[PDB]
């Protein structure tokens, strides 16, 4: 690298010393790609190594084998793991890719070209070459459209991915006739983020998910061709600040936004995040409390439709804020729940008490592992459930853990966005290093009073 | 002055005030602990307990906090104070519904 006195930046700002060195930027970036792929491959190897096949696969502290299993790679009808070789081969391919990526990264950091445009005009860039920035965006957006269409190929032509909503308790299903229509996809993206609908955590079916992936892949590919074949407009070039620091701020704000989104995804979804592979979400295990208790006391002999609780609303059933009958526990805040074992028990108008009395199914009944243990409690130091629960079980819900890690780190990335937003705006103005000490804006404008 | 409305204009006053606030706060809280040394506590709001006694419908987060303090006392002093031989059974220890 280089020193402070010539770069102007201290060691704790040294990664900015390579702002104007595109080759070193490439070296650091390819090395980072190696780091990410290396962690992915390593963790997939561990989650293969620490596997107990007879138990349900969420109590072993495994976060990304659910990522492979959501693709249906070795998943039984009810959700049985069956085989671990796809997870193993995924981890090893990631590790080899990590080795080649890391070698390329260290090569471009050390012996790679120090500056790129003198030999490769296709790879060199000053940070005001707005046309070539748009070209780079076009390339990356084409890549993202290719990845989305890859998920399309898996869902429609490779016979994979698990649907939790198949009858009997779900099934790995090759998706036929996905819903790609603009009305449902855009209404899915422009609705409220609260419990009435949920903005982006509202996708109840994988035809809707895959149709959204149709839309995102097509849009990214067409916008990639657009960004390749167009030039920034005067309004964009006036409203935006164009520097490598402002680009960091835009990327940081965006990645914080999708980090917050991914946190909420992990916390609430049971469709794109199967509960059978992740553990229950917030509203479930509490819906499971109410469901197990209702079936148990209607089994003993006590009625539940005429059963009234301590507060006048119902110990086992009440009416929702809307005119539908919902479960009577304290899970009445979670009346908007949709999990694979309630729709066969869901009636149009009400909960269909005669269906509850007679048409109960034993898969629904045996869906009590979500109830008894595994609720999204779990403490910082494992232990059992609530903060008073004692050292009896070793469990924490991966939904909780990769929700809180993601939202915390997304908040820190929001802070980083704020930092580089302000510094980029101030540097493009000209006072990143302070006020000029002789002609301040303060002395040039009027006093307040 | 344009963000918060009022701003510091003398750094002697600024630094004296930032000396003043923690010393003042710690001294007042020290006087509070001096008060608690003789079991003088700000526990009851007599109007609030009288009106909550004559009306079972009125309640506050304060009333919840008082009852919750009774819960802390009852469930903790049993082992917290071993010299008191507090073998209080579970049916005199107070509960909510279902917990």
């Amino acid at each position: 690298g280089r020193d402070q006195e010539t770069t102007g930046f201290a060691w704790w700002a040294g990664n900015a010393r390579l702002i104007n060195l595109s080759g070193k930027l490439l070296g650091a970036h390819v090395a980072h790609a190696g780091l990410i792929v290396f962690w992915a491959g390593a963790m997939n190897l561990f989650e293969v190594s620490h596997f107990v096949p007879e138990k349900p696969m969420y109590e072993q502290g495994l976060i990304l084998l659910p990522h492979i299993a959501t693709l249906g790679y070795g998943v039984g009808p009810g959700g049985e793991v069956l085989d671990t070789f796809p997870y193993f081969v995924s981890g090893v391919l990631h590790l080899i890719s990590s080795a080649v990526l890391g070698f390329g990264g260290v090569y471009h950091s050390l012996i790679g070209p120090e500056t790129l445009e003198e030999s490769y005009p296709f790879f060199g860039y000053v940070w005001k070459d707005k046309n070539k920035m748009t070209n780079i965006l076009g390339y990356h957006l084409i890549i993202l459209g290719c990845g989305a269409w890859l998920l399309v190929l898996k869902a429609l032509y490779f016979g994979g991915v698990y649907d939790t909503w198949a009858p009997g308790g779900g099934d790995v299903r090759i998706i036929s006739n996905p819903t790609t229509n603009a009305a449902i996809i855009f209404g899915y993206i422009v609705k409220s983020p609260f419990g009435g609908d949920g903005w982006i955590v509202s996708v109840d079916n994988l035809e809707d998910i895959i149709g959204g992936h149709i839309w995102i892949g097509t849009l990214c590919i067409l916008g990639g061709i657009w960004h390749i074949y167009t030039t920034p407009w005067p309004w964009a070039r006036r409203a935006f600040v164009w520097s490598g620091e402002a680009y960091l701020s835009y990327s940081l704000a965006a990645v914080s936004l999708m980090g917050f989104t991914a946190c909420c995804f992990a916390w609430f979804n049971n469709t794109a995040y199967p509960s059978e592979f992740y553990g229950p979400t917030g509203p479930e295990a509490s819906q499971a409390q109410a469901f197990t208790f209702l079936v148990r006391d209607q089994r003993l002999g006590a009625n539940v439709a005429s059963a009234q609780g301590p507060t006048g609303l119902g110990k086992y059933l009440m009416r929702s804020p809307t005119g539908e009958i919902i479960f009577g526990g304290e899970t009445m805040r979670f009346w908007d729940f949709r999990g694979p074992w309630v729709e066969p028990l869901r009636g149009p108008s009400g909960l269909d008490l005669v269906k509850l009395k007679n048409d109960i199914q034993p898969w629904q009944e045996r869906r009590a592992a979500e109830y008894m243990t595994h609720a999204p409690l779990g403490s910082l130091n494992s232990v059992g459930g609530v903060a008073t629960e004692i050292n009896a079980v070793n469990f924490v819900s991966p939904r909780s853990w990769l929700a809180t890690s993601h939202f915390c780190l997304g908040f820190f990335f929001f802070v980083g966005h704020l930092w580089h937003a302000g510094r980029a705006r101030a540097a493009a103005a000209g006072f990143e290093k302070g006020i000029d000490r002789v002609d301040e804006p303060v002395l040039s404008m009027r006093p307040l009073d | 002055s344009q963000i918060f409305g009022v701003a510091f204009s003398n750094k002697r006053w600024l630094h004296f005030f930032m000396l003043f606030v923690p010393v003042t706060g710690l001294w007042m809280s020290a006087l509070g602990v001096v008060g608690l040394a003789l079991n003088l506590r700000a526990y009851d709001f007599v109007s609030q307990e009288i009106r909550a006694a004559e009306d079972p419908e009125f309640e506050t987060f304060y009333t919840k906090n008082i009852l919750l303090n009774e819960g802390i006392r009852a469930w903790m002093a049993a082992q917290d104070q071993p010299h008191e031989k507090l073998t209080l059974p579970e049916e005199v220890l107070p509960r909510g519904n279902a917990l």
């Binding site: 006093p447 307040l448 009073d449 | 002055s1 409305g5 009022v6 701003a7 204009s9 003398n10 109007s47």
Partner: peptide, 30 residues
């Protein structure tokens, strides 16, 4: 009489805050 006492002290302190914000002494020495 209880409630108007609290109301008066609260709105009075808010009034002193308002008066100190907009009708303060103009600042001198920096």
């Amino acid at each position: 009489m209880e409630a108007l006492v609290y109301t008066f002290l609260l709105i009075g302190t808010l009034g002193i805050i308002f008066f100190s914000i907009f009708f303060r002494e103009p600042p001198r020495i920096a």
